[PDB]
Paper text:
Here, we identify an evolutionarily conserved hexapeptide sequence as the major aggregation-prone region (APR) of gastrointestinal peptides of the glucagon family: xFxxWL. We determine nine polymorphic crystal structures of the APR segments of glucagon-like peptides 1 and 2, and exendin and its derivatives. We propose that the pH-dependent changes of the protonation states of glutamate/aspartate residues of APRs initiate switching between the amyloid and the folded, monomeric forms of the hormones. Our results highlight the dual role of short aggregation core motifs in reversible amyloid formation and receptor binding.
Seven of the nine structures present an antiparallel (AP) backbone of class 7 or 8 topology, while 2 peptides, those of APRGLP2 and polymorph D of APRTc5b, form class 1 or class 4 steric zippers both comprising of parallel (PA) β-sheets. The glucagon-like APRs (APRGLP2 and APRGLP1) show an extensive contact surface (Sc = ~0.80; Area = ~160 Å2) along the extended, linear backbone of high complementarity, while exendin-like sequences (APRex-4 and APRTc5b) present generally smaller values (Sc = ~0.65; Area = ~110 Å2). Aromatic side chains form intrasheet aromatic ladders in the two parallel structures of APRGLP2 and APRTc5b (polymorph D), as well as in both polymorphic structures of APRex-4. Additionally, within a zipper, amide groups of Gln and Asn side chains can stabilize parallel β-sheets by axial H-bond ladders. The amyloid crystal structures of APRGLP1, APRGLP2, and APRex-4 revealed the nature of emerging interactions between charge-abolished side chains contributing to steric zipper stabilization.
Numbering used by the authors: 1 to 6
The structure:
Amino acid sequence: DFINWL
């Protein structure tokens, strides 16, 4: 699982 916040 991951968080990708741009």
